[PDB]
Amino acid sequence: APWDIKEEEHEIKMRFDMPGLSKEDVKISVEDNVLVIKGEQKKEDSDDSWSGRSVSSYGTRLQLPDNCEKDKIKAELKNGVLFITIPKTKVERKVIDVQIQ
Amino acid sequence: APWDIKEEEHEIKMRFDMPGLSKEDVKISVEDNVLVIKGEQKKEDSDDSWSGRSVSSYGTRLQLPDNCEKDKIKAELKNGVLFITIPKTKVERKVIDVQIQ
Amino acid sequence: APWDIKEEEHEIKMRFDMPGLSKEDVKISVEDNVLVIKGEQKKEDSDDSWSGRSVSSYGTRLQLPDNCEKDKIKAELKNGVLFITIPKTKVERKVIDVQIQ
Amino acid sequence: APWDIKEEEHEIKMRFDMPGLSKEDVKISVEDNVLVIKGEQKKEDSDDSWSGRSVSSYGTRLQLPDNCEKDKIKAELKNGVLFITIPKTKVERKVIDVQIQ
Amino acid sequence: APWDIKEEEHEIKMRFDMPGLSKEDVKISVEDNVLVIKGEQKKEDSDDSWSGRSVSSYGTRLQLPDNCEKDKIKAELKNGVLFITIPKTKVERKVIDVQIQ
Amino acid sequence: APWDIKEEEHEIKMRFDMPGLSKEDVKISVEDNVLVIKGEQKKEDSDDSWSGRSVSSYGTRLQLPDNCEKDKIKAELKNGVLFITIPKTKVERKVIDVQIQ
Amino acid sequence: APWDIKEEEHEIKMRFDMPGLSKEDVKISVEDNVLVIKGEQKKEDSDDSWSGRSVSSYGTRLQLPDNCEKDKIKAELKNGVLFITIPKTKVERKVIDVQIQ
Amino acid sequence: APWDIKEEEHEIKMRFDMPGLSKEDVKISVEDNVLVIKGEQKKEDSDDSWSGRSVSSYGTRLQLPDNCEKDKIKAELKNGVLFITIPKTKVERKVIDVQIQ
Amino acid sequence: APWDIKEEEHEIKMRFDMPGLSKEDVKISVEDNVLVIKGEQKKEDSDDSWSGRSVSSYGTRLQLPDNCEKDKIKAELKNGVLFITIPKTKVERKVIDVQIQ
Amino acid sequence: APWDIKEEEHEIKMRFDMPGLSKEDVKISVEDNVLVIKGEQKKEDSDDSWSGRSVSSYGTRLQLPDNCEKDKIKAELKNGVLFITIPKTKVERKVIDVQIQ
Amino acid sequence: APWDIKEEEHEIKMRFDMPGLSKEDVKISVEDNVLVIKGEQKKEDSDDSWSGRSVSSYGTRLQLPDNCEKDKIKAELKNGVLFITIPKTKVERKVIDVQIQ
Amino acid sequence: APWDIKEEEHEIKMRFDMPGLSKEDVKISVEDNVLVIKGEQKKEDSDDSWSGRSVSSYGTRLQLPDNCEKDKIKAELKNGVLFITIPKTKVERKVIDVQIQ
């Protein structure tokens, strides 16, 4: 299965995966509320000696409900699998319901 | 015809419809600018004694141009038909046009 | 789910549904063994002031196995939902089975 | 090719095209951050004397990243071709990167 | 609408259209009875500085019923719209009808 | 790109890839000339706490031209990527060509 | 248009059509309530001397609501067009309507 | 070929077929004019010890032109093949033909 | 079958067909080498009193190899079937064959 | 369900089925390792007197992993159902596993 | 690739191909301006002793711009490949261009 | 028709075909039991002077039941048609049949 993206019990979480890609070719970037991921192909630093070299596009968008709180943002890569944990927001301070009468 | 959603001559109006659903299983919820509707199936409180019991999903999104003014928001249900009337906003205080020269 | 039509434990039952349609625009008609339903659009008696006025065709056929016994035929409309209960018949007074030898 | 829409080396640019439409039937309109274009068919002011008169819908949306700065907004029409040049914004004053550890 | 081609009340008329193309890149050619149009892309004489440069094929055939009378043949280009007016012929000097008996 | 399978300049090589799968859930098996791969889902040994858990089938066939020489067979897993290197055979000791005359 | 079949103001009427078929190759047949038409190809009695001889199937079913009254049944063929006029029945001697309460 | 259903030279005949089904799991049932067949799966009385156990639905409808004469109705099963022979009726005591004039 | 168009053993022949159309609404027209047929709908001269009135387009083109010799051109309509017989031409006065060497 | 083909707990088993076909029209044939089945249509030895006579092709291939041991091969036909039981082989006398290091 | 048909630097050229067909079964025919090719199947003069005998249709049309000059027309067949070289014409003695003003 | 491949009355035979390809660009190759054909495009040795030059892939596999006996293998090319005749094998020295009891 390619990816997961969901509000967990307390936060927001993404998870994707990529063969070959090690701890080197990974980058991200933040904005006022926009996250972006940039993975690329460093499958040119050992040797080719091959045919089925894999090359594709990896960077991708994201927007958080509230402006992305930056400090506690965590992420990790293992066995060709990246995943990013990020804090939830504090929505629902006020609401009103039906008066259908 | 399932629904209508439109800016009338003075306000914003939604209208949808649902068999069975009476004045009980209806709920809404507001946000800073987000409306959401939650209807569900209380077709379990009289008796089944049936085969063609109808059950589906009814809640749905909405966003208003300007933050939803809450007081005068009205809505009503009759003959299995929901409809919500909500105040318009006061856009277009300034504009500029072509200077194609 | 649109409709149900079935032999229950003791009788025959139809059930359908229609938004808007109240206790006024409903009619039926019987025959020697043919039932027919005629619903129509009285969505012209309050006001239009609208775009998504719903108008369609509602009348529909039926035939009962035995000629429709007329007295105890019942029906009802609620929350835009029609349903007709009608007596079963007394088939299977005699039968013969295989003699495949 | 119908249109182009892109961030150039320094600004934002749209370009589209329309047969017949001259410097008369063109209009635009601005908002806090919303641009809209309104072209229409003045192919009724010379004469018809024709069959293949062209009539369609031309107005279209746009939103700029930052609220549309209004003064230096330029545009032009030639040979049935419209194009609008508009100032870029000043995003990316701060950023944070991975700490995948 | 792309083009029109028709016998008018007195003559024959074509009309087509092309963004960008001005009074320069247009050419035609005549034959004993064959007309041909050759438009091309001079969208290389101002500057590119662009992505959505439009380039396509424009030349096209035609045959007139009678050999094309050459003198009074007229044509014009405006707002990226070409159109050619050409004299009709003098067919139907004799006819015979049914004798189905 | 999913996989590569090819005769290299001197040997035979397979390469595939699998997210999540680490150095644990991997197995192979040999035969007289048949290779088979068995990967499975050990995504049950850390915790679920998730929705998009990935589970599928991974084992797959192979046959080598000549009976698989077993000693020098190598393979490796990194960044969720498996690949197996295996010795080539020594075909083409004799041949005959056309005599089409 | 191939055919017409309808209850007129007072009776029941069919109309169809067939090239070539003259007053010879036409037949019908009645039943307790079933009508059937049998037209065939007598395009073998003058001469072939041809390629595009037309041959197809023409007979077709019908059932009348009440058993077909036989005497006044009329029909006619002209210009390769058949049409059958037949008496209506006397349905609706009794009816009952809604009691939806 | 699955089945045959036809009026023979003197009667009416059905024939179908079913693997496994022996002389046990077969049943029929008659009505005023309705025949029905009920075969089922007794592939649970010897043992499973298997994977490709076959289970499906076998009962099926029939209506005879005239009310089914019951005595001489015959049927048989052999080599997983059922077939039912039933008496024809005595239709066509009277008829009327065209008067197309 | 709709139509036939063919060179017979000695001439050229067309044949088509049209329900309703009698000996009245038929017309043709000749040219230097162009034949055209014009049938239309006179299904307005008796009465409508109907629903399935048939109306369509019937005129159609033709070109003969050599200019249409006019005198001996024959045609006829019967049972809603038109057919036109026309003289062949006298092609093939000279020819040359391969010299492939 | 048409057929089953599988390695059971101890052997190899096929099972298929055929209406009509009795113990007569069945044949098989063996090879070094190839099995083939030949059923045909002896539905010509009793009488036709029918329309829905069934005729098709029944012979089919098979290959066993190891050369087919011939003695204990069993098979049977009942209720139009064929099935062949055949001995398994003795594979897996030696194996080697990963050394992914 | 099946065929080529093109105006070369000085003439007109066709080229096609056909297995089996030798220098015998080839024919052409000329007209005032129409060329036609007739190849056929003489794959009946040696012996069949075969299954995959090839038989198809080979004759085909052509029209030249100007009436086909007959003398210098050349053609040849080799290795199951035919090709015809034919003289070009002398078009474009006069022309007129745009006056779009 | 592209090819034929079949066991004749005494041997095995292939036949295919290729335009242009003469007695030069043809090659085959044998193995223990594998035949392979290699045709290629020598349509570069006379001249191009063309557009519709044909180039494709021609080599193809084959396996014989028994190891290919090499001496008497024959083949030939004529009129762009290849065909290979090869000796049959001597299968069926022993067999066993049903004992369905």
Author numbering:
A (entry chain 11), B (entry chain 8), C (entry chain 12), D (entry chain 5), E (entry chain 10), F (entry chain 7), ...: 127 to 227
Give sentences from the paper.
Small heat shock proteins (sHsps) represent a class of highly conserved molecular chaperones that prevent irreversible unfolding or aggregation of proteins under stress conditions to maintain protein homeostasis. In this work, we study Hsp21, a chloroplast-localized sHsp in all photosynthesizing plants that plays a critical role in chloroplast development, fruit maturation, thermomemory regulation and protection of the photosynthetic complex during heat stress. DXPS catalyzes the first and rate-limiting step of the methylerythritol 4-phosphate (MEP) pathway responsible for the synthesis of metabolic precursors for isoprenoids in plants. Here we show the formation of a stable complex between Arabidopsis thaliana plastid sHsp, Hsp21, and its natural substrate 1-deoxy-D-xylulose 5-phosphate synthase (DXPS) under heat stress, and report cryo-electron microscopy structures of Hsp21, DXPS and Hsp21-DXPS complex at near-atomic resolution.
We also determined the structure of the Hsp21 oligomer in the absence of a substrate. Initial refinement produced a tetrahedral reconstruction at 5 Å resolution with uniformly scattered densities displayed in the inner cavity of the tetrahedron. Subsequent refinement by masking out these densities improved the overall resolution of the map to 4.6 Å, resolving a total of twelve identical subunits. Only the densities for the ACD and CTR are visible (except for short stretches of NTRs ), suggesting that the inherently flexible NTRs are confined to the inner cavity to some extent and contribute to the scattered densities. The map permitted the construction of a model of the ACD with seven β strands (denoted as β2- β9, with β6 missing in our structure), in striking contrast to the six-stranded ACD structure identified in the Hsp21-DXPS complex, suggesting that the ACD partly unfolds to peel away the first β strand (β2) during its interaction with DXPS. Comparison of the ACDs between the DXPS-bound and DXPS-free states uncovers major conformational transitions in the core β-sandwich domain accompanying substrate binding, from a natural “twisted” state to an “aligned” state where the two β-sheets are aligned near parallel to each other (middle and right). Oligomerization of Hsp21 is primarily mediated via the dimeric and non-dimeric interfaces. At the dimeric interface, the β5-β7 loop engages in interaction with β-strands 2 and 3 of the opposite ACD through limited hydrogen bonding (middle). The non-dimeric interface, on the other hand, involves binding of the Val181 and Ile183 residues within the conserved IXVXI oligomerization motif in the CTR to the hydrophobic groove of the ACD formed between β4 and β8 strands of the neighboring monomer (right, and c).
